[PDB]
Symmetry: D2
Subunit: 155 residues, 4 copies
């Protein structure tokens, strides 16, 4: 038995949905995560070509929670500009979380504007909802949204 929790973050961007989606769907993005997010990772291992099926093993500096987890690039839908990335090992999965999924959806607003709609769904054992509730936030998705938009806006 698990409780389902869904959290959301949105970010408006003065660029086309296609220009933002190009970055998010780029297979070369994985190897550029330390450039995009300086000092976020102590260690990042990329297993694969950066496309769907790629696993990322992320290790953070001492003091931070998650210390380490693995993420898998599970699904890309270019038409809908939608990307799914599952946490498959470590991190919150060691604190009663049985399922953890990030979804990013770049939605066009105008011709040269869009909204980055990021969300994370997780399933928790009730014995742990009070423990992990405060730990799980939209931080990682927000950081990505901010960095990608800044990369695209400044050209």
């Amino acid at each position: 038995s698990t409780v389902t929790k869904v959290i959301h973050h949105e970010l408006e961007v003065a660029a086309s949905a296609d220009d933002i989606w190009t970055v998010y769907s780029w297979p070369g993005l994985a190897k550029h995560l330390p450039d995009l997010l300086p000092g976020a990772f102590e260690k990042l291992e990329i297993i694969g070509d950066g496309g769907v099926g790629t696993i990322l093993d992320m290790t953070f500096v001492p003091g931070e929670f998650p210390h380490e987890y693995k993420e898998k690039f599970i699904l890309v839908d270019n038409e809908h500009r939608l990307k799914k990335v599952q946490m498959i090992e470590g991190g919150y999965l060691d604190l009663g979380v049985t399922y953890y999924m990030d979804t990013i959806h770049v939605v066009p607003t105008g011709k040269d504007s869009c909204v980055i709609k990021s969300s994370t769904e997780y399933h928790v054992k009730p014995e742990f909802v009070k423990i992990v509730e405060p730990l799980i936030t939209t931080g990682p998705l927000a950081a990505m949204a901010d960095a990608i938009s800044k990369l695209v806006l400044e050209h």
Copy 2:
């Protein structure tokens, strides 16, 4: 397939903690001397997987088992702490007092700045003793809600019981 690894390279805030102590006591029908000799045995560390079967996914022992020894403990998937290092700080034969400090990983990544286990084996009679196992930790006050349910006397109690079982199953010196 291809594996690529990319490794980059508050002075009052760090001591802005509250101190918590949790105590465990196991009184057992064996001598302090018999219980202490297991605890103070330098060979104990390498026998932890035997003493506590299915506790560890991986155990690394750095050093000779005496004071200064570091134990790197990795636990099976799903379990919290997944990994941490502990260091043998004190093995005091006269007082039957052992100190073990968590030095990296585990609760130290969840707002805890200091974590020390103390085991004191105290006679209560000629063939009985108390194993007093305690954990003193310092936490940033705003992680007390998070971390208190996780920090229990579980591993210290597990050790006390397993060692007691060994001894009460009367083997010898």
Copy 3:
């Protein structure tokens, strides 16, 4: 199943070596400038698995790709060197001179005390250059029989050819 890891803890002899130098030169129909910009590109390290597909089982890059960067290279089973670390010592733009030192593993476990690669890109004309890649190593004389057949200009020659291919397949700045 159970994993247990146990980790314990001549001043003239160490410099009693002979010096060997092996030279490789690739003269190519591209400018020194074009060839150098690839070699001196800080992003080159993270693209080595792309530049040299199937060369590495694992590659770790420690640092930003500039001077000071350490590369930990693990090769597929059966291949010698299985693993070693190299360090970017010099990236000299004025002379088109790059130095890369093997600092741990590989030949350093087979009697070699020092191993330095130097790459110098020299103009031979307006649209041509020589890539002079050399390896200077110091070995204990009694491992020369062992290690000389193993140490070749292979990896330096592989790099020179791969970079040349990239450039000669005329892409841009």
Copy 4:
């Protein structure tokens, strides 16, 4: 195509073959290798209970060749006091060796004496026989023989 090479070492011991074999066949021996051979290993990982099927991953200090290899406890014959241990990864297998096997055979001489007969067979590609010939010796087996006999003789 490979060349076959077999090298041998013998050690006479003033103890019974059974008293020596007891040590060699002891499943607890693996975890006591650093005690038996101080300073031989930088790191020793034991994967298994110490019995047949156990894998040992041995890492040596910088400067030494092999830096690292895995060994597997393949066969025990108690009647004949015979033990087989194969090198399965790393070490000489990265220098044209396609097969590497250690055999230890404790043979009784008298009632309270025996000979420890240790040998290693390997198969090499001819392109590498001159390279690995000087590297492969009975050292590891000799070290084991010396340490076990000393343990048993001194009681």
